[PDB]
RNA sequence: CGCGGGGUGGAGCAGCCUGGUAGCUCGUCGGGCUCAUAACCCGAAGGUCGUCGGUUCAAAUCCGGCCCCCGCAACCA
RNA sequence: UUGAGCCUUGAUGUGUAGGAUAGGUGGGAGGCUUUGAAGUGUGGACGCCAGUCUGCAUGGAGCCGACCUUGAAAUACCACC
RNA sequence: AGCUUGACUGCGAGCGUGACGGCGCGAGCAGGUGCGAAAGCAGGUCAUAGUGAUCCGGUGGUUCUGAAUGGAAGGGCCAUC
């Protein structure tokens, strides 16, 4: 006890203080997981952001060239026969007014909701669970819109959101260290500059100083 | 806080008082109480009993100090100099040594009794 | 006196803010009415009064 | 033309380098108890945390507006 | 030496409510541990008296959850601050 | 009472008085609205006190200006206290 085994098979890959490259870090982060199943690759970086300023609160979505480094469950709410067309271009289930038992409770088995304007009675009156879950569909983000058909296949083009908490932390899973180097690297490089897109207008001192990335077995890597 | 588990306690009685500080051998106060401030007044505070919520009163200004085992300096001519100590042995308390320290004046001052009549 | 000037906004997000005399800090009402816009010159809803 | 400490039953004030206990207490109202009034002792009645927001199930504890108070012609050109 | 400050070191969370001690907080049915842990009691340390640790009482590979159900959020396995 | 905000907007043939600054009366067109079944109507209240030019500073817009030249400051003009 207590530096858990999976942590012992791993001595002396790490030294303090030391600097490197993306292709350098994955080929590390790669060498630090021993699992026998298929592990995941997140992100958790400080922001160089006030806590006492609105204007520096970071919280929205993007598309990226791999998404979060796997496939999603995309659920639509519609009527008559264009729901069947939506499930088709990019969804796996309809959303049904017997689908608010699941969302009400907090149940859901799904990652991203697309409603059209005259269905979206059915999840405007449970944003108080679907808001804090990261599954609300929004108007300002072209998530409630007539032309679901369209809204559906944007939603499996790779949908990463992010919200920043206290201290300005902010948290985002983007691969698996089974992916190809050049499969991880592009994704990466896409993170940090839909994240330099999202700088606000005022930062404090230096915004982004390094980028780390973990799969908590042998602790995280930054660049 | 940490507790200390060392002390000296300081006594005073009067005719109709009397009162207790606790300090550290270094000469350093950590709690005090009196008969009086234990919440009685007139000759209510002359009581055998106040004599006895003046030592558990002090006694809970160091509860979280950890002090139990002490010593003890008496001054004055009040008859609670003892029975604040017959019922500070019943609250818990170990006592090692009592010295009386009441100072003995070369006159000076007159003595307040008067009357002159 | 107390009752003071006041700006409105407007449900076209004008820069152009109506004026009108009307208490807030101790007998509010509020005021929606409509007026004429210098962006267009087809009018714009002016609302709210703060 | 502009700033930050305070605002918590009728008054005064803690609560706040853990985000929820509504508190210390003065007065008001009513009983024990001494020769008797008060002390003492046993109790009762009444809170839009100035007032709306941010992040939230949640803000007295952090912030931002709006307001009032503050040593003071806030500048009056 | 000291008000304010900084590099260096070591452990943290019951302010209420439980069945229950959810620091804030992001993921999550498959995984850690495996000559040692489980738990409610007199003794020992501490205590918010609920239990946390220790030898015994004792056991000897678990422990754990989904249904159901408290809660805004959960109670394996584990990041970020 | 119902509807409505014309307490609108670009322009204006002309007329009355005061030493001047100043103050009163108005046909008719142009843009966009409203009342009304429609004719017809509205350029703030029943009308006589609810009140300063200018200098200056703040404030939205603007190549109109701008001293080598291209931006810029300052000024001008339209808005405005």
Same mark, same amino acid.
């Given at each position: 006890?207590?530096?858990?085994?999976?942590?012992?098979?791993?001595?002396?890959?790490?030294?303090?203080?030391?600097?490197?490259?993306?292709?350098?870090?994955?080929?590390?982060?790669?060498?630090?997981?021993?699992?026998?199943?298929?592990?995941?690759?997140?992100?958790?970086?400080?922001?160089?952001?006030?806590?006492?300023?609105?204007?520096?609160?970071?919280?929205?979505?993007?598309?990226?060239?791999?998404?979060?480094?796997?496939?999603?469950?995309?659920?639509?709410?519609?009527?008559?026969?264009? $729901?069947?067309?939506?499930?088709?271009?990019? $969804?796996?289930?309809?959303?049904?007014?017997?689908?608010?038992?699941?969302?009400?409770?907090?149940?859901?088995?799904?990652?991203?909701?697309? $409603?059209?304007?005259?269905?979206?009675?059915?999840?405007?009156?449970?944003?108080?669970?679907?808001?804090?879950?990261?599954?609300?569909?929004?108007?300002?983000?072209?998530?409630?819109?007539?032309?679901?058909?369209?809204?559906?296949?944007?939603?499996?083009?790779?949908?990463?959101?992010?919200?920043?908490?206290?201290?300005?932390?902010?948290?985002?899973?983007?691969?698996?260290?089974?992916?190809?180097?050049?499969?991880?690297?592009?994704?990466?490089?896409?993170?940090?500059?839909?994240?330099?897109? $999202?700088?606000?207008?005022?930062?404090?001192?230096?915004?982004?100083?390094?980028?780390?990335?973990?799969?908590?077995?042998?602790?995280?890597?930054?660049? | 806080?940490?507790?200390?588990? #060392?002390?000296?306690?300081?006594?005073?009685?009067?005719?109709?008082?009397?009162?207790?500080?606790?300090? #550290?051998?270094?000469?350093?106060?950590?709690?005090?109480?009196?008969?009086?401030?234990?919440?009685?007044?007139?000759?209510?505070?002359?009581?055998?009993?106040?004599?006895?919520?003046?030592?558990?009163?002090?006694? #809970?200004?160091?509860?979280?100090?950890?002090?139990?085992?002490?010593?003890?300096?008496?001054?004055?001519?009040?008859?609670?100099?003892?029975?604040?100590?017959?019922?500070?042995?019943?609250?818990?308390?170990?006592?090692?040594?009592?010295? #009386?320290?009441?100072?003995?004046?070369?006159?000076?001052?007159?003595?307040?009794?008067?009357?002159?009549? | 006196?107390?009752?003071?000037?006041?700006?409105?906004?407007?449900?076209?997000?004008?820069?152009?803010?109506? =004026? =009108?005399?009307?208490?807030?800090?101790?007998?509010?009402?509020?005021?929606?009415?409509?007026?004429?816009?210098?962006?267009?010159?087809?009018?714009?809803?002016?609302?709210?009064?703060?």
């Amino acid at each position: 006890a207590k530096l858990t085994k999976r942590m012992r098979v791993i001595r002396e890959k790490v030294d303090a203080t030391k600097q490197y490259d993306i292709n350098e870090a994955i080929a590390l982060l790669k060498e630090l997981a021993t699992a026998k199943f298929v592990e995941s690759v997140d992100v958790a970086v400080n922001l160089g952001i006030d806590a006492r300023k609105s204007d520096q609160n970071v919280r929205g979505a993007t598309v990226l060239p791999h998404g979060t480094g796997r496939s999603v469950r995309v659920a639509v709410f519609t009527q008559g026969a264009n $729901a069947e067309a939506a499930k088709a271009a990019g $969804a796996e289930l309809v959303g049904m007014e017997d689908l608010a038992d699941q969302i009400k409770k907090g149940e859901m088995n799904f990652d991203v909701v697309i $409603a059209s304007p005259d269905a979206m009675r059915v999840v405007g009156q449970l944003g108080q669970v679907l808001g804090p879950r990261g599954l609300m569909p929004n108007p300002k983000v072209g998530t409630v819109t007539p032309n679901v058909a369209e809204a559906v296949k944007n939603a499996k083009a790779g949908q990463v959101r992010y919200r920043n908490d206290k201290n300005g932390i902010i948290h985002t899973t983007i691969g698996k260290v089974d992916f190809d180097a050049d499969k991880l690297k592009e994704n990466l490089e896409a993170l940090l500059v839909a994240l330099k897109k $999202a700088k606000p207008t005022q930062a404090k001192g230096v915004y982004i100083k390094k980028v780390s990335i973990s799969t908590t077995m042998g602790a995280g890597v930054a660049v | 806080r940490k507790q200390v588990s #060392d002390g000296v306690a300081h006594i005073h009685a009067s005719f109709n008082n009397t009162i207790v500080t606790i300090t #550290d051998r270094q000469g350093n106060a950590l709690g005090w109480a009196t008969a009086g401030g234990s919440g009685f007044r007139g000759s209510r505070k002359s009581t055998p009993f106040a004599a006895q919520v003046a030592a558990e009163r002090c006694a #809970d200004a160091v509860k979280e100090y950890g002090i139990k085992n002490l010593e003890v300096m008496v001054k004055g001519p009040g008859p609670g100099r003892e029975s604040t100590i017959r019922a500070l042995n019943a609250a818990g308390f170990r006592i090692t040594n009592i010295t #009386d320290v009441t100072p003995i004046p070369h006159n000076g001052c007159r003595p307040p009794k008067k009357r002159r009549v | 006196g107390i009752r003071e000037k006041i700006k409105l906004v407007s449900s076209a997000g004008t820069g152009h803010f109506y =004026t =009108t005399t009307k208490n807030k800090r101790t007998k509010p009402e509020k005021l929606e009415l409509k007026k004429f816009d210098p962006v267009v010159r087809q009018h714009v809803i002016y609302k709210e009064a703060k």
